[PDB]
């Protein structure tokens, strides 16, 4: 993941799928490498069940 350090000295973590900082859109975290993606950037349309684990193209 790219991390932006903005005006305020805050850190924004960027979806590697789109590499656009301007979300809104919800994200999901990889349970292997812990990179986070926007739902639509990885084809996720609904909140997954919590027992489930998600993994990202690379892992």
């Amino acid at each position: 993941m790219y991390v932006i350090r903005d005006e305020w000295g805050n850190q924004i973590w960027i979806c590697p799928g789109c590499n656009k900082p301007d979300d809104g859109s919800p994200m999901i975290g990889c349970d292997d490498c812990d990179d986070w993606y926007h739902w639509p950037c990885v084809g996720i349309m609904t909140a997954p069940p919590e027992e489930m684990q998600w993994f990202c193209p690379k892992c």
Binding site: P26, I28, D31, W36, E50, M52, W54
Partner: peptide, 6 residues
């Protein structure tokens, strides 16, 4: 899994 939103 683990998810988030603002």
């Amino acid at each position: 899994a683990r998810t988030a939103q603002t």
